[PDB]
Design a binder for this molecule. Sequence first.
Ligand SMILES: Nc1nc2c(ncn2[C@@H]2O[C@H](COP(=O)(O)OP(=O)(O)O)[C@@H](O)[C@H]2O)c(=O)[nH]1
Ligand SMILES: Nc1nc2c(ncn2[C@@H]2O[C@H](COP(=O)(O)OP(=O)(O)O)[C@@H](O)[C@H]2O)c(=O)[nH]1
Ligand SMILES: [K+]
Ligand SMILES: [Mg+2]
Ligand SMILES: [Mg+2]
Ligand SMILES: [Mg+2]
Ligand SMILES: [Zn+2]
Lengths: 230, 99, 131, 299, 136, 333, 244
Amino acid sequence: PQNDYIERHIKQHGKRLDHEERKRKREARESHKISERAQKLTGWKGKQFAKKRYAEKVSMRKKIKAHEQSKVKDALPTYLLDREQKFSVPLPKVRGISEEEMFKVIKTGKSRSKSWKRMITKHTFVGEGFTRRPVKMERIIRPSALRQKKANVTHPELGVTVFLPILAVKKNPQSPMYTQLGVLTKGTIIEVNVSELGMVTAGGKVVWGKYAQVTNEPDRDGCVNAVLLV
Amino acid sequence: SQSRINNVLNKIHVAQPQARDDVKRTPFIPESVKNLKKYDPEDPNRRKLARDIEAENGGAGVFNVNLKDKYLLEDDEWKNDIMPEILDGKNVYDFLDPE
Amino acid sequence: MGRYSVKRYKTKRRTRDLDLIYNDLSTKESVQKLLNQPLDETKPGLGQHYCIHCAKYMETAIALKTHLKGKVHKRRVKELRGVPYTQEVSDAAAGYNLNKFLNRVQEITQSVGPEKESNEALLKEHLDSTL
Amino acid sequence: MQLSWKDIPTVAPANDLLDIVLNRTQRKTPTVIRPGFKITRIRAFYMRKVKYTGEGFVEKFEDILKGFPNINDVHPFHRDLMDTLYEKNHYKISLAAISRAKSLVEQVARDYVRLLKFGQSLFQCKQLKRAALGRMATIVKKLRDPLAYLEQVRQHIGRLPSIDPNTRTLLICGYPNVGKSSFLRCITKSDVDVQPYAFTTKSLYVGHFDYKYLRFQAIDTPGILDRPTEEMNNIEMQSIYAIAHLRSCVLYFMDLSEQCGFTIEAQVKLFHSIKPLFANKSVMVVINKTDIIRPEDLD
Amino acid sequence: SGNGAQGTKFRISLGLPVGAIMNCADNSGARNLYIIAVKGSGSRLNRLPAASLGDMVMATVKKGKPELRKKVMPAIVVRQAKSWRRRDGVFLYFEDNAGVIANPKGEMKGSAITGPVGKECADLWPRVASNSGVVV
Amino acid sequence: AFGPKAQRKRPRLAASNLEDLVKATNEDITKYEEKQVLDATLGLMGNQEDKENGWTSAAKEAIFSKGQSKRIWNELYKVIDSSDVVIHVLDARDPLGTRCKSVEEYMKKETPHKHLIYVLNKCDLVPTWVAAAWVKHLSKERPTLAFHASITNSFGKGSLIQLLRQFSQLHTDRKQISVGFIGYPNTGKSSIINTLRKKKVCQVAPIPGETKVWQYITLMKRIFLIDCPGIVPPSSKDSEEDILFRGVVRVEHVTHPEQYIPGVLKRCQVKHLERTYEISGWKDATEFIEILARKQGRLLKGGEPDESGVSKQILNDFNRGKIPWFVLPPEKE
Amino acid sequence: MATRTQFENSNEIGVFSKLTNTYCLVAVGGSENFYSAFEAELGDAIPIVHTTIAGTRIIGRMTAGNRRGLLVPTQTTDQELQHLRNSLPDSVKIQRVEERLSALGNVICCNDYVALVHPDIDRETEELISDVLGVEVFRQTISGNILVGSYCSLSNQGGLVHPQTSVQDQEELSSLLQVPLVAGTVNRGSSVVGAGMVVNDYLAVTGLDTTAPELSVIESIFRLQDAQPESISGNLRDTLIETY
RNA sequence: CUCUUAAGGUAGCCAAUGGAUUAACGAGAUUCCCACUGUCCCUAUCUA
Ligand SMILES: Nc1nc2c(ncn2[C@@H]2O[C@H](COP(=O)(O)OP(=O)(O)O)[C@@H](O)[C@H]2O)c(=O)[nH]1
Ligand SMILES: Nc1nc2c(ncn2[C@@H]2O[C@H](COP(=O)(O)OP(=O)(O)O)[C@@H](O)[C@H]2O)c(=O)[nH]1
Ligand SMILES: [K+]
Ligand SMILES: [Mg+2]
Ligand SMILES: [Mg+2]
Ligand SMILES: [Mg+2]
Ligand SMILES: [Zn+2]
């Protein structure tokens, strides 16, 4: 068969003789079936059924509201219309993180008798030109999978988020030791490259570096989120 | 195109014989074959085929055909006769002989 | 049943049959074909140095000569002296295809036998000359 | 050539695909883990979740990508026909969006397995697995429009007639209502509908017959209006591309009774206008409807 | 019973498990065949798949043409050394194990088969029967 | 664009006229015919006809994928992350064949402060001018040092040591520097380290995978050397034959080595082969193997020559340097 | 007079049946549909016989004969031989042959007047073929192919050889057989034509998968229809050029 | 102030040889091949 052969077949032969009646009775039985499913489905399927029922009812209410609203009834230039898009920090206080949580003891030796190496369990920024220290003298371990270079920065102005490279770690509120180790936890002040935002000072200089505050826990969600400090 | 020429010639040729002897080799068609009436599936009065016999008796895999029914013997009562095979450690078949 | 007989006469370690070797020796064409073989890489001695009686390849001509000077080869030669014992002999001893067996024996004694003997004589003297 | 592309598996939309893959993870991988177990066990549990979900999405995307035809590698007749039917630009952009989603899902799975190697507790490991699955879900949700387009394309392209561009072909062409479909019905057993109104036939129809122990195919085309190519529409583009590509015997049908709605002068103008199309193709003119009026008794 | 086989196949004693090497009885240039799989094989823990006469196997050529080598191809077993029962009333066996190269439809790659072919295999495979000079 | 609610009824870019349409379609058909002829020269003669008869190429042996394990690559990235200087060890017989271009790219992109140089080892296995030309052509890209590794009779040891002293003096801010040795298996990294130490401190063997973990060696108080397991970057153009002739696989685990013997005949000079093996007169690889086996007495039970054993020994001789061969350097400009 | 049928969905008609001018032999397998396909063309004009050879079904490949004789191999039981003798009239000679090459259908290709034989058949088997089948005997190959009975299909009117048979070989074989020869396939490209079809002077039966050009060539060479000689190669040249 | 790419056509100069790629030996560690087989498919049977 070719092209719309089922539609042509219906046009040339019709449907089954009980098609309309059977479809009509199925649609009439739908109300009983929906009630039976709501009371009989169990577990995950029941929870999904209730969730979908709530969403459908919300959608119907919005459609009714829009219909009745219809039945009742920035100052951009010409080339931008018809187009779419206190010195307190936002996190003055964050959860305290102890050294027991921050560091993991690494055991060394054949019988695991030595315990002087420590591994940082959080995400870090190691800076440019990082080379690992030789393994015999490496006390602090900052593994490469937990090293970050870029962050999602939200600008309070214009409400946009951009993926910006990290320039430095300015202040980790937990400790200056974590600051100098480059630990990126919630509330850490970082320096970010803001070159693609196109900022200019009052003197005509181009801004390409500013500060931001980390607003999430990268050890929990695998990424760095920060809000720009403006 | 000269590429598909040789094989076309080789497969389009018909080999022909030429004499080699004065012996007549003529096609042989039996008289009953040449007098046979053509079978018609859509015809009320046709020969009954063995598959029709099978379908009316048991169908395929249930009908048990008798292979002795077509025997051309001197006496037709001999058709359903069991041929003995062994007699006292001897095969009957290698003693069976005219005269 | 015993290990010696099992591992010597296992079916996968079978050797050529004596009636087949008798047929190999009966005709001159078979003798020449088995005497002059193409260089085969997978046979000992590159397919040369083949004793027809024992159906056996030797690595070298000196090996073939030392083999011909042996009781094993003479045993095989003695075995190939008589009628090659087909199934016809067993059938006739049972008393079946008697005329066929007797005709075969007459043909062996009249034609096939002496021709095989002459071929064996020529083959032995050729092996003596070349070895 | 493949010549026919009915064997493409069904393309689920974005929400349905999310349901299928995520519920497959919840069903086919174990769901019970305890905070009292070894951290190695907990990490392996959540790593298996992330990896299995990633593989499910990748297998769906691969089944999509392998099934659909390669528009630039098919015979040029099929390339032009599918371009007319489905808009080649949108076709390739949708398939490329699927390919990009596949790459992003693989990257997310690899990144979060590597992170999960350093998880210290059930809470952190669970948060990392939820982050990985949520990022996969975001990627899939961004595929909503291309998936719906591709599902429509798959359903339509599975029903296209199989046309061999290198076999023996009789092309049938002319104005609407001149008898093209009627002649195809007379010479083949194709079931093309015959009606007294313009453009009953909106796609190419194929029939077959045997002449001197050879299989011939005949192509009925939608009618052609006498317009320039710039104002020619896609329905006529089907016939134009068929005539341009298929080396054949083109049969141009003429009606002298003008019951097609067109005059004899217009039909001759159409012939002389489509004259450049049948170069190095055998051409015949069939004057249909001679039971009404014959060429003998013209003016 | 395999694709291309003609009808059903009754059980025969198995003689060729995976890892066996049989001779090549056709004239396609192969010398022996190494069995790596058996078509129609069942499944049971620790049990080796094995082939009998008239079975289709997947085999590689160990000795023969390099063109035939490094390729996995179907083969049909035409002789076996393991004794098997014929329903007429005799146990019988051949001197060697032997197979012939085929395609998945069971059509012969070579043009002739040297040596006898078991009746069971010949009756199961029509192309083997057509290429056979000796049928036991 | 398409569907129940589609509004496109015309082509976006119509042909200018029917003459343009027919000419473009004729050119497209001719290009398609030529392209299909070109792919029928190879692919239909190969892969497509194998499915018709049901033939399949045998499985790729797991031995040819050695040097590509996650453990080895974890070790490699660890040594790179620890190294201030990275030495890429190349075989003087086939340096471009033994180059790790992907790792060079990654180092130039992600770690530009690490200094990457070339050491061309096994320079005693090629003629003098071949080594000179290879040093000249590789120096256009990176600093290259020709080398012969040996504890007692080496070449280039003083040059390499004074170069590492210059690197240390440049990084006087660091209290010590680390030099990591990377490259293909069996190119001689452990040998070079042993040569610099004048002591057998790293295990050396012709079998691939002799070095399995990294190893620190103190050369001077301010210079450390890091031995690394060999790596083989995956590629699609490189075949199992190329991998085998680069000395990467264990020949004793390959299935049929007689099929790789013709590559030996292609890569080696005939007079050199006949001087190495005291034979002559072969016209093909199988004849060469048979003659060598009969000379050596490598016969099996029954007089068949041991083709596989002789082929494995030949492949070992080629890789271990008992047969002279080299790849010509690029032409002088 | 070329018909198409299958034996239990097999296109190998010549494997499972034997057709001469005066009798037809069929395998016993399953229903009576194969027998009835032959009976629809032959009626009661010649005997159509159900038979087994060594308890097998491959009877066209196990036996050879013509309108005067029928040769069965040494594996035939006394009971099968007796059943064949009871079914056929005395005008057909029936002989059991002691030959090593027991696939007589594969190793003998014959008609009422001549026979091609495998080059290694016995002298006694050749004399028996000459005496019982009543034909001249020639030791031959079809372009290097032994198994002439499976790689050639022959009648008194014409012959079909496998399509890789050269022109010179065709000419020499046609002179030996004194019938016109053509090269072709059967059953949609099969080269084993003798095992693919059966034919006599007034009937040919091939598999269902035989294409219309192959069937037209078969009818032409065997002169099956009333006005269809072997000289319509010129009339079918266009179809054969398009097909080949 | 200066430093490295001058070396060229399948084996060179320079001092038989240019070597630890060391023969032999070894209840030393390791890989593979032939032969061989109840290690196994898949277990059966006999003696004390
Ligand atoms: N009198 C007459 N009318 C015809 C003939 N062929 C077609 N028609 C009529 O013409 C109308 C359109 O024919 P159709 O096959 O749809 O032409 P198409 O539009 O070119 O495919 C139908 O209503 C037919 O009844 C013919 O040969 N004679
Ligand atoms: N002739 C020669 N052989 C060498 C040289 N360097 C190394 N080899 C040999 O090549 C083989 C592999 O050496 P190895 O140090 O283990 O290479 P690795 O895998 O990179 O560590 C050893 O047998 C060495 O003796 C050299 O400069 N010349
Ligand atoms: K090594
Ligand atoms: Mg129409
Ligand atoms: Mg097991
Ligand atoms: Mg090493
Ligand atoms: Zn002897």
